[PDB]
Design a protein around this ligand. Sequence first.
Ligand SMILES: NC(=O)c1cccc2c1O/C(=C\c1ccc(C(=O)N3CCn4c(nnc4C4CC4)C3)cc1)C2=O
Ligand SMILES: [Cl-]
Length: 241
Amino acid sequence: KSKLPKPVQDLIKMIFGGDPIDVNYEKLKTDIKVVDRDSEEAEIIRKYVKNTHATTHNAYDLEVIDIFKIEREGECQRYKPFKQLHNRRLLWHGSRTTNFAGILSQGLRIAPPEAPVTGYMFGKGIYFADMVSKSANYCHTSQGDPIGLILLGEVALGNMYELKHASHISKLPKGKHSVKGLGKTTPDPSANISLDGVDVPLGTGISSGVNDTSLLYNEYIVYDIAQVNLKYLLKLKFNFK
Ligand SMILES: NC(=O)c1cccc2c1O/C(=C\c1ccc(C(=O)N3CCn4c(nnc4C4CC4)C3)cc1)C2=O
Ligand SMILES: [Cl-]
């Protein structure tokens, strides 16, 4: 009775634990398309995964099962103020499978005003990595449950407030659009690629040459939900050490 392509049906099943597949699909308010395995997009994405897995995160390997291109209703319009902003980057965001119904239906949101701050170095915002594994850790996948989901969002970073140490940012300095936490390791900046006019930092990790930083790896934080345009959802296989 589902009229969806099988990979999308299996995505839906995964995301929703009673209701028919197609009705649960509609709840996501998200256009979802299978990216062809042997397409240019899929190649770039598999490379991003391949190259940006941190050496510190060696309890598992990642295999891309399916790549989905996703279009949240309303997001094109919402993102529009930032679509020409400079320094737009394709970055990872990992979360538990059980969050993905909410995430797709309502977009990535900032943690609510009253949630606890532990876990967040730079206050309540939306957090992204340029290292797939840093984000993939937040899938809270296990031996027993080895399949997880991760997003690639276009993030309008603009002028980044670049910090090495934890600071609960209540208000960005004038002219800044985002915070970047500076890691000791960074994808090779010379190996950046452009996909649909969005920078993809898929170079292998090199020393950043940033001294006295508390972060191993970069992270990027936006404080306005409108600065995020979700693009891809990957179904990943975690193979454990
Ligand atoms: N998620 C990422 O890809 C990511 C990337 C880079 C840095 C950070 C990232 O997540 C960060 C923090 C973080 C991520 C997750 C959590 C986490 O486990 N939380 C508990 C429950 N929870 C939270 N958000 N949604 C939920 C579920 C109940 C509805 C907070 C706490 C903190 C970073 O500092
Ligand atoms: Cl973690």
